[PDB]
Symmetry: none
Subunit: 128 residues, 2 copies
């Protein structure tokens, strides 16, 4: 992929946002911005130029699943890649995410190697 | 350009003629036809198309299989793809977005509906 792909990392926990940012950076991706809930996320997405969204499941104001749905329903950004971050490999939560159009999901905590592999799978389907 | 070449994909020839007639009515006269996903790739491979309009259900290779094939290919990856679905099933609308569709329209539709769908796609693409 283009090393300049612009990512948005969304989590209300500042430490995790910083952790993910470090992992992306280690993978060669330095163009990353943060948001702390789905509302903040949506306000930032409107400026434009984002190519990928990495979002936690649980957040105040607007959670992960609601963030996903909004993007999926928006004409200008309906096809934006969205990787959902979840706390346990719970079949039923994973199902909720697939039903909402998630591009992929990852279980936290995760290593750089796992992140790389989940990104690479989304890239290949979208010819990124 | 009103010279942008479309590929219209559906196994029902009558629906293909309709779509081709709605395009002419909008000013687009450079239109080709394909009967299934297989036949469509066969043409897209040969080059120079600028838009795909495809039905959801077709034999051999359906609309979602076609989109997926297109999106994974180097060259054809950025081609605009408008999916035609039979009813507003939320399930289909979402699977088309997760797969990279450019837009969707519910059949039967009008020249009017079609035009609005095309303009939003051209505007988001900067075409």
């Amino acid at each position: 992929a283009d090393k300049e792909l612009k990512f948005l990392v969304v989590d209300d926990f500042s430490t995790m946002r910083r952790i993910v940012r470090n992992l992306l950076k280690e993978l060669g991706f330095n163009n990353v911005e943060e948001a702390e809930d789905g509302v903040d996320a949506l306000n930032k997405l409107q400026a434009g130029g984002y190519g990928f969204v990495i979002s936690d499941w649980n957040m105040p104001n607007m959670d992960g699943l609601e963030l996903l749905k909004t993007i999926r329903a928006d004409g200008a950004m309906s096809a934006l890649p969205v990787l959902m971050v979840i706390a346990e490999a719970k079949k039923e939560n994973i199902i909720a995410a697939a039903q909402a159009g998630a591009s992929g999901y990852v279980v936290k905590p995760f290593t750089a190697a796992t992140l790389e592999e989940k990104l690479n799978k989304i890239f290949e389907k979208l010819g990124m």
